[PDB]
Write a protein that binds this ligand. Structure first.
Ligand SMILES: [Cl-]
Ligand SMILES: [Cl-]
Ligand SMILES: [Cl-]
Ligand SMILES: [Cl-]
Ligand SMILES: [Cl-]
Ligand SMILES: [Cl-]
Ligand SMILES: [Cl-]
Ligand SMILES: [Cl-]
Ligand SMILES: [Cl-]
Ligand SMILES: [Cl-]
Ligand SMILES: [Cl-]
Ligand SMILES: [Cl-]
Ligand SMILES: [Mn+2]
Ligand SMILES: [Mn+2]
Ligand SMILES: [Mn+2]
Ligand SMILES: [Mn+2]
Ligand SMILES: [Mn+2]
Ligand SMILES: [Mn+2]
Ligand SMILES: [Mn+2]
Ligand SMILES: [Mn+2]
Ligand SMILES: [Mn+2]
Ligand SMILES: [Mn+2]
Ligand SMILES: [Mn+2]
Ligand SMILES: [Mn+2]
Ligand SMILES: [Mn+2]
Ligand SMILES: [Mn+2]
Ligand SMILES: [Mn+2]
Ligand SMILES: [Mn+2]
Ligand SMILES: [Mn+2]
Ligand SMILES: [Mn+2]
Ligand SMILES: [Mn+2]
Ligand SMILES: [Mn+2]
Ligand SMILES: [Mn+2]
Ligand SMILES: [Mn+2]
Ligand SMILES: [Mn+2]
Lengths: 167, 169, 169, 167, 166, 169, 166, 169, 169, 166, 167, 169
């Protein structure tokens, strides 16, 4: 069996096409990718540069967040590839993210909790914004977005509880 | 740098709020939590007290159910936390669950199969009832419920199969 | 506690029925099962009989697809069990699948990439076709289909990429 | 070899009986079970609902306690079965435990340390109370109680040290 | 370079491997078909059993499925290593005569009987093709011994559910 | 540092003797060793030769008992070594055990449950009989017996429960 | 149902397995007795050795014990898979003639000699029963080859403690 | 909710005290701690400095002893913490241990066996001496000591056996 | 005991300083950090976007590179922290890296091999340039750089080998 | 004591093991030399391959190296267990005639050809010495079957890179 | 082949000698060993006796330090043996270490951070002092010292960050 | 992105060359490779053919040395690849090693300890001889040699210690 045998039977990538995402779908995932990638960069920045009370817990929880964002970035980027899109998470493209910035300096732990919670909440904000039209077109892509939302919001609660009083 | 620096930029928990669930959403997860917690308590009760035919399989399958329900309860409770809710699974609060009760005594294995299937189906009933309004409000929370539904119904099938005969076709 | 004790409380499979899928739902899942099982049988055929450039990578990725399809078939079949359905994946039933065939002969690796991408896409087509009415009736069953969709479409990309050149922008 | 062959040789559960615990033994273990079960329920309640300084450490240490109490509950319940007793840890039976309650609301971390230490110390109190007559009758059951005491008191120290000053 | 390699005779063409006859290959193909049929029927039963001692049987069926799947892969690849070209496509595997558990819910005790028969028919094929295979290629036969040991073990374990002391 | 250096400081096995068990203690542990070794040999016999309902669960649980008895025998024998005793678990010595025998024939699973529960209880009886004087002399040796008691009695319950019906309350 | 299964002849009764002769079964029973005797004597020595290079011998004895235990289980179950009924109760195993390390503390160098003899006597039994077993059931014999390889390996490793270069 | 709420209910460390050990109990564990800590320090000294016949076995067995003593020391120290005591295992404090000393030099393997057995037996001597009054006061603390006793005496046997001949019967 | 007790003894971070690196040392590690971080970002870009011959091997090898560079970046950043420096690997700061850029589009596998080898070699160039003055000041920091150099150059070889022919001898 | 053990005849001297002939030992020695040569050449190629589909070949060479190393150890130790004295010192292994990949960078496609030839020459040795080994010691031959299965598998996997459908 | 055959071929420990360290090298490693051993003793002392805010993080990080120092002690001691030296880390020899002491009493967590950071920094001080002449004589021994320096200084930063404000 | 795109940016192996070792460096690493490969071949010979006292410990430690030498050979050879060199470890090349030979015969364990310590020391001698010029040119390559030195010298001590008695102080 040769490439010719296969082509005449019509069992080829060109004859049997898959789901091809709309440029809207592809663009919504792209936004999520940028924000997830900025998140793990800023996350690591904070990881190294935190100082002050309850240092270790925060150092470790920032690594957990970094790990999740890295994994989710790969998942979204590859979801794009699977649906015909082309991801971009080069540093210059990622720099245009609006999730926030922890700065170049050492950061008090208490202050870092607030900044990171905001950065995570901004990344979730993007997913929730793009979710409905993605779900409408491709429910399976929205399912991936559901996993990312659950995990980020879980971590947002865990990290932020450090700075809360009872209600 | 300091907490002064962060509040001037507005990168805080107060200045940037996360998704805050309606009391309806939180109330619907609280129901699921209560029943899942009751399910694993009853599960362990039965795990210890079953007697009779095909004992070991049921002993082990009950522990598998117990483990799933424990994990799912942590998941639902923490999902509530994540959306602004405040879970309650204290024993007195869980005792108000209406899923069913295996009793305090030694229980025949065949009888236990029937009871536990009903407990699982009741817990699933709660989930399927709270589902639509939760999904309309928070699709992510409903995805969690789908995972719970899939696993519980799988277990209800595996456990119940001990007592089944081939259906009339 | 005897069987009798359990019946009089109404804690049984008979009194407390679970979700009972429509015959449409079950039929939809059965189509997906048939195509998934066809996929792993064809996958193994190819796994053995590929010859030519980048042999090892293809041999391995075909096993990864086989493993996924096998697991997903188990999941669908058991999902059917959980909802009242009776799956069939005997070889004569699976042979009616229309996803395609890799043939009885040694196959060139480049030819195999093309064919396997087609078999995978045909399997995904079935899922996408049965999806909406399944989702309407039972969102949990649709969540299983979503997991299957993500993984199959991921694999189709990875395998197919061997034969691709950058798109004309 | 059939059930009849076995019965005539006298090798049966009915002919060769094991250690049968006194209703006192069985009742002392039952008290321990209730308290261990309440402990892991309240433990999880706190696990979810803590807020404030050193959140993560406490969240994790409450899971360690929950895990130990769950295991020990199964051990005691099954020890009862092995000695002829019949355990009950249904939610309504467990609700009658007097170990204490963390309440339905969010709880400050510092406050949670105090409440949990008390809940653990109350559970240990029950074991120490029932220990002597159990040991007298069935040393092996007391040995299980020794393992539970060591572990709970270890965790009681670990959790409470958070709120201590040097002596 | 490839020409360097050709000049010293260190090639698949110059140094041929052991080549199986079409009978050796046919003997292994039969074994493959039956083993593949076995794991497909095994899974069918795994899903559809109902009744007494359900879980043990559910699990043991999966252990049989896993064994038959691995063995099928070993057999197909043995064929490949000796020049044969295996076929286990569904239509080809549907011609197996090991038996069929049907498409319906099946009583556990009935399933034990059927599956033991299916296993024993697969072992029958292996023992039938064995001697000509061992005469020609003793290493192929060693694989067959491994498959035989494991299948007959599982046949004993599964079938024991229905047995009385003799 | 030579041997001589060690002798003159009195840092030797001869100068610094350990705990030396009484002949009663050693004899008590030897009885327990004999019964434990008999237990795992009989356990394996049964493991192979059981036939009938709930075969697999019993086959597996018998291996779990075998594993436990084997480990516990090693522990007792070595406990004896640690205290000056010399254990014997050769087959001719173990054959004098009075815990019972499962016979040379295929055994019905229900008959095997009964017999094995008896063998286990007879082994526990030996431990309980030798316990108090062992505890009086050497509480550490008694703590080993406690661990053995807990596990054997746990197993007797799990195995025996197959043949039990709820007790008359 | 069970009647459904009976009508199509898919039963343990209708489809019989390979049945061993009473000689095959007797050959395996001998192997079982000796292997079981081996691990019991192995443990005895494991506890009671005293003297030079103690730890190595303590550990290697346990490795022998583990191997002989697993092999005993394989042999007993092979018997079961082919229709035999194994017996390894202590009184039955006490009739083994492989040898005995006695009930006393044993010098390590003496123990090496005794244990190697015990292993070699077990291997002797296997090689004696081999040819009639291989004639009748080549798969049974394949198990015997595995047992032989492992025991002779351990015999070499253990015995080497006492050897001089030749 | 707040720390005000907790002190009004009395659920605190101050209002509900745990078991507080007598200075005698704490003093007896402190002795065990000092000696166990000395034992692993001397153990490592010997681990590095042994020379001669059957080197590797002893090297490895010394590390096993070191590991056990380290773990047991953490156990005893933390047990003290749990009962209100305050352990001290600083080097100067541990140097007052009377269990024995392996010296600073290369040590023949046979000689090392003799010394280490004596060190282990001395550490065990401390435990057996403090035992009865600890058990009378806190049976749980004595159970810990039983575990330590069992493992140390096992190791004293395994290590010492290198130098033993069959006893005179 | 208290923080008063510790400051009178002088056992503090203020009273006993660790090695404080020169701004030159910190500046040299900062360069390495920026480039290692750029390397794994570009690595993932390529991981997703490669198309063409021997796809899977390159996909996987790029992930191995990504993993190494991530770990090494954590190592360098934390080394800076340890010597008094303050790392910066925010996206805008990393975007100033001059190692090279794989572009935003689908990239042929052969072309990707060439690009990534150059990116790796550029990152290595930075290390070898900062090395001598770092080693003169802090041999420990230079040892870290040796580990990075070894792994990166190994990967540059493995990745580049896809496109190589035997050299002219 | 050792004298106690001597009085009951439980010694390596009194109870001898299976002893291989010098031909059995010579047959295994040849297999050892070739297997050792195989893993050394395998590593050489592992380092020095250049060109298309590099990584797959790099990895599969290592899998071949690992297999040949383990098999070499099994063969040498089998010799030891039956009284032989293996030799795999570099000078001795240099006499192997399986082939040589040279000391230079080697094109991947050329390497596939060479390595398959090297594997097939090793398998050739095993099949040549097989029948006299199996006649004398069937357990030794069982080891040979394992080695044969694995090497021929790897030969197929590696060589397939260069093959066309027939 | 016998001991005699080997001796005549000259393949023996006595005929073919290895690297033999200078008493200076051996003495520099010995200093490092003492300090590493004191470090893990004091580390454990603190591990047990800490009380106060962020107890758990510090309890665990002190175990990580203890584990590293124990491993490194074994590495240095065995490096000495490999180069002809003879290590001594008996408690009385180790007591002469000047790294510092956490005392016999319970210790506030904040105070412990400062003391331990100082103890670690003092151990690193010793390694840096002895490093240059060791590196000159035996680069491989200095390489081991590089691994120990990197790890101790890493932990020194991690532990001390607890008590820092941003700069 | 095509190959062409990559060439015009100068992102290739040709435009961006890596570190290229001198022929001296490569020759130095080649000597180390030859001796390491000789070491593991001789190690295996000995592993099989040792007879006599403390057999098992020596058998095992020889495998540990073999494993180390095998891994280190791979590291050196690939280090050579990473820097432009072409390693050779074919048997005829390795046979020119001068580290020593254990012979074709059974060897007494005490004789083997002596010989293997010599082979290991000869291998270390090669490394130490080639070290300084390698370090001068490429400190990263020297760091690999340091790791090899530490482990080989560790092993020589452990193996050799079997035959040592305490030194005359
Ligand atoms: Cl990732
Ligand atoms: Cl949980
Ligand atoms: Cl599956
Ligand atoms: Cl549990
Ligand atoms: Cl498979
Ligand atoms: Cl054991
Ligand atoms: Cl076993
Ligand atoms: Cl520890
Ligand atoms: Cl990282
Ligand atoms: Cl090997
Ligand atoms: Cl250590
Ligand atoms: Cl290697
Ligand atoms: Mn913390
Ligand atoms: Mn990826
Ligand atoms: Mn979803
Ligand atoms: Mn989902
Ligand atoms: Mn949780
Ligand atoms: Mn399944
Ligand atoms: Mn349980
Ligand atoms: Mn106790
Ligand atoms: Mn105990
Ligand atoms: Mn069962
Ligand atoms: Mn395969
Ligand atoms: Mn065979
Ligand atoms: Mn043992
Ligand atoms: Mn030894
Ligand atoms: Mn078994
Ligand atoms: Mn601790
Ligand atoms: Mn980090
Ligand atoms: Mn490839
Ligand atoms: Mn070996
Ligand atoms: Mn060590
Ligand atoms: Mn270095
Ligand atoms: Mn280094
Ligand atoms: Mn390699």
């Amino acid at each position: 069996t040769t490439i010719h045998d296969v082509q005449t039977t019509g069992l080829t990538q060109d004859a049997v096409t898959g789901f091809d995402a709309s440029s809207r779908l592809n663009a919504g995932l792209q936004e999520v990718l940028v924000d997830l990638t900025a998140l793990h960069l800023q996350g690591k920045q904070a990881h190294w540069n935190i100082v002050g009370e309850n240092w270790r817990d925060l150092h470790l929880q920032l690594d957990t967040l970094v790990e999740a964002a890295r994994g989710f970035s790969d998942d979204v980027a590859e979801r794009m590839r699977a649906v015909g899109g082309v991801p971009d998470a080069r540093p210059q493209t990622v720099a245009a993210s609006r999730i926030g910035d922890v700065g170049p300096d050492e950061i008090d732990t208490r202050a870092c909790v607030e900044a990171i919670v905001a950065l995570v909440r901004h990344t979730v904000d993007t997913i929730r914004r793009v979710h409905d039209p993605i779900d409408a077109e491709d429910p399976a892509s929205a399912d991936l977005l559901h996993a990312i939302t659950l995990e980020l919001e879980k971590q947002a609660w865990m990290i932020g509880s450090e700075n809360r009083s009872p209600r």
